């Protein structure tokens, strides 16, 4: 949840 990645949908982290 959020504008980047970290969750199944979105998140707060880069997809690194």
PDB file of C-alpha atoms in Angstrom:
ATOM      1  CA  UNK A   1       0.000   0.000   0.000  1.00  0.00           C
ATOM      2  CA  UNK A   2       1.440   3.318  -1.158  1.00  0.00           C
ATOM      3  CA  UNK A   3       3.040   4.869  -4.249  1.00  0.00           C
ATOM      4  CA  UNK A   4       5.919   2.417  -4.885  1.00  0.00           C
ATOM      5  CA  UNK A   5       6.493  -1.261  -3.898  1.00  0.00           C
ATOM      6  CA  UNK A   6       6.771  -3.471  -0.818  1.00  0.00           C
ATOM      7  CA  UNK A   7       3.203  -4.776  -0.568  1.00  0.00           C
ATOM      8  CA  UNK A   8       1.221  -6.944  -2.982  1.00  0.00           C
ATOM      9  CA  UNK A   9      -0.324  -3.665  -4.232  1.00  0.00           C
ATOM     10  CA  UNK A  10       2.022  -0.687  -3.993  1.00  0.00           C
ATOM     11  CA  UNK A  11       4.123   0.219  -0.958  1.00  0.00           C
ATOM     12  CA  UNK A  12       6.736   2.754   0.167  1.00  0.00           C
ATOM     13  CA  UNK A  13       9.941   1.124  -1.135  1.00  0.00           C
ATOM     14  CA  UNK A  14      11.753   0.919  -4.455  1.00  0.00           C
ATOM     15  CA  UNK A  15      11.531  -2.456  -6.319  1.00  0.00           C
ATOM     16  CA  UNK A  16      15.239  -3.157  -5.731  1.00  0.00           C
TER      17      UNK A  16
END
